[PDB]
Amino acid sequence: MVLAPGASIFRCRQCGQTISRRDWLLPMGGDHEHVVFNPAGMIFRVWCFSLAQGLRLIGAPSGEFSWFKGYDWTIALCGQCGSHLGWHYEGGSQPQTFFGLIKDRLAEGPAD
Numbered sequence: 001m002v003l004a005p006g007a008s009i010f011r012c013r014q015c016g017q018t019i020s021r022r023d024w025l026l027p028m029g030g031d032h033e034h035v036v037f038n039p040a041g042m043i044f045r046v047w048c049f050s051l052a053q054g055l056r057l058i059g060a061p062s063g064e065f066s067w068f069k070g071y072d073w074t075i076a077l078c079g080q081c082g083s084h085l086g087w088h089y090e091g092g093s094q095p096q097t098f099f100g101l102i103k104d105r106l107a108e109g110p111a112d
Ligand SMILES: O=C1CC[C@H](N2C(=O)c3ccccc3C2=O)C(=O)N1
Pocket: 037, 038, 039, 040, 064, 065, 066, 067, 068, 073, 087
């Protein structure tokens, strides 16, 4: 516990929608940070979270190109502005589900 913490909540960088919390970071494979690339060669610094809110999960899951063995992904947009914030992963084991969010698309700041 700290008084007046400034690194508590992650919001959408583009609009401020509440998305996640530092307390919910999830060390997948021993690290909450996973640096990965997609088939279009884009590099993402992905932070894994157990939980997130304020997103909209688009479509149905796919296992194609999944960065996390045993998980299928759905695109996760900011539910307010539509910014692509990351992916929701499901269908796996321990945990069954989690979120992989793009670190530089979030803003971190004080609690609400
Ligand atoms: O775990 C994942 C999530 C999605 C992701 N990915 C993308 O970022 C992407 C962009 C364009 C076409 C196809 C893909 C897809 O598989 C990817 O490569 N792995």
